[PDB]
Nucleic acid binder design. Structure first.
Lengths: 103, 52
RNA sequence: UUAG
RNA sequence: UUAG
């Protein structure tokens, strides 16, 4: 029921006394540009994106120091997973999970 | 004596009743965006570009 | 969307 | 350039 523009990468957020405009591009062809005008912007960008230097998203005017300083101090961690698909089960099905100790 | 922004590729020209805004990018890093606001735009783009 |  |  929501209006969602997929494949739309925000590039710049402009926020002013009179309103906001958000500049985004098509991810499938980055030349194609869109300008979304609104009363307010809700930023949901991951902290990792906000941390990115040089910026992946530019804020105009620049965010105040008390905001940027916080973005720098906070940690943004990492963890990954490997999916292994087999045709046969060869492990104990009753065991939800088991470990492996490193050398 | 002129103000020239080199390495600035215009991507979109917006022209309205109240004025114009021109969206351009840095050719050396196309993520970096600029919005130039003005009363009028003079288009000097080659016919080949306009045909593209 | 020449945002309403 | 939160165009003036």
């Amino acid at each position: 029921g929501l209006d969602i523009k997929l494949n739309t990468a925000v590039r710049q957020v402009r926020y002013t006394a009179s309103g906001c405009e958000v500049i985004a591009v098509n991810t499938r062809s980055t030349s194609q540009t869109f300008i979304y005008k609104c009363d307010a912007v809700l930023c949901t960008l991951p902290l990792g994106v906000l941390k990115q230097q040089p910026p992946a998203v530019q804020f105009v005017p620049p965010l105040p120091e008390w905001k940027t300083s916080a973005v720098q101090r906070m940690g943004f961690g990492n963890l990954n997973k490997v999916v292994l698909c087999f045709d046969r089960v060869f492990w104990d099905p009753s065991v939800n999970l088991f470990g492996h100790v490193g050398s």
